[PDB]
Amino acid sequence: DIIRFGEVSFSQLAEGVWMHTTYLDLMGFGPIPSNGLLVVNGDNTILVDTAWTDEQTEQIVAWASMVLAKPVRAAVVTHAHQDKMGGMAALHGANIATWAHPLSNELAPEEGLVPARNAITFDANGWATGEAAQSLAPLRLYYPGGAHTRDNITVGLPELGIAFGGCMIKAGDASNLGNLADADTAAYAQSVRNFAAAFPDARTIAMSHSPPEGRKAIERTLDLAEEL
Amino acid sequence: DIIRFGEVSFSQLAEGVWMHTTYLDLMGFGPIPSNGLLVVNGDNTILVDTAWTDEQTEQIVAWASMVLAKPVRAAVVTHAHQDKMGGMAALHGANIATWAHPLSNELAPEEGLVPARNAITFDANGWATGEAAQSLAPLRLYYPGGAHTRDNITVGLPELGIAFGGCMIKAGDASNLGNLADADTAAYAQSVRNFAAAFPDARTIAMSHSPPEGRKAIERTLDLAEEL
C-alpha cells in the first residue's frame, strides 16, 4: 500500500514510522529507487535520508508538515552519496537541523554534496552519544564500520523491531551488492555482522534500494560480502 | 531489426558490419545493455569489445564462426570496464589475438579483468600504428584522450561512414554521461572534440549503451561534457 504525493511514494511501516521512496535515472539506465524514513517524535518528525534532489526533498518536507501535521525538525543522512544527501540544501533552506557521520561531511564536497551542519559523535562501541543521540531519539544510530562506503551509518527503532541498513544492506534475493565504487570490500562482511548484532531482535529490515523485508536480507548481504 | 541468438542481439549496421548487444544487471537496478561490433575482414571478423561475461562472449564467437562463417581472428577493447572486457578469458581460450590501449592493460587487474595480450601503439596524433593498425585494418583506432575513462579508445570505419564512440559518447537525448566513477572530467569535452574531428564525415555514430544514431549524439555529449 502506497501514498503517492508529487514525485514521492510514502508507505507506513509502523505507527509513526513512514518510508519515503523517490526515483532518479542516475546514469541513463533507468530510474533508481531510494528509500528513507520519516519517524514521528511527539509533534514532529525525524527525517532519515534526503531524496535524490532538492525538489524531491522539499516534497517530503511539505508532506510531513502539511499532511502528517508533524513538521520535520531534524534529519540524519546515512552517507555521502546523492540518493542519501542530494537534497541537503532544501533541508538547510527550511532551517532543519541536519546530522551525519563526520566522514560524510568531509567526503560530501568532492561528491558534489552539501555537508550536514552537525557531526554525530559515535562512542568507541559505534553507538551515537551526545547531542545526536539526545536530539534524534527514539532513533538509535550505529556506525557498523566500512562497507558500502567508509562513512555509512545505520539507524534503528528497537521497540518497533525496525532496523534500517541504508545502502549497506541489500535484498534477500540480491545477486550483487549494487554500487561498490566507494566500498570498503575488506571490512564489508564484518560491518554487516556488527549491524546484525547491533539490532539483534528487529524482524523488519529496511534498506535503500528495495522494499522492507525480514532478516534474510542481512543473511544474503553477508553471504555476498563474504565472497568479495 | 534484430537477430536474437542465445543471450545476444545482433543488428546489421552495414554490409559486413554487425552490432552485438548483451545485458547484465550490474548493480541490481535492472539489466544494462552494452554494444560492440563485428567487422568482416575477408574470411574473418574483427571483434570490437567483449560482452559482459565469458559466456556471452563465447556466444558471440560461436555466432561469428558458425552463422556468419567468418570466425573471429582479432579483438580490440575500448577500455577496462566489465561491459567492454568482461569476456577476455573466453577470447583467450579460443586463442583469439586481443588488443587494447596500454593503460587498459595496466588498469584491468584492479578492475577484476584480464589484460589483452597486445598493447596498441598509438602515434603522437592518437592514431594507431604498427602491428595493431595493420592487423585490425580496415578499422581505424583513435585515442581521443581521457573522458569516460582515461584509457577509452574509439574505432572507426570511414569508408562506411560509421564511427564507434564506446562509452565516451552518449545518446542525442541523454540527460547525463552515465557512469563517471573513473571519468576524466577536465579532459572529457576536448576528447569528445578530438573524436568528432578524428571522424569528421561519419554520419552513423554507434556507442556502448544506446542504439546507433546521427552526429547529434556527439553534439549532446559535448554539451554535457562542457558543463562538467
Ligand SMILES: [Cl-]
Ligand atoms: Cl533490535
Ligand SMILES: [Cl-]
Ligand atoms: Cl569520417
Ligand SMILES: [Zn+2]
Ligand atoms: Zn551509496
Ligand SMILES: [Zn+2]
Ligand atoms: Zn544507495
Ligand SMILES: [Zn+2]
Ligand atoms: Zn566504462
Ligand SMILES: [Zn+2]
Ligand atoms: Zn559503459
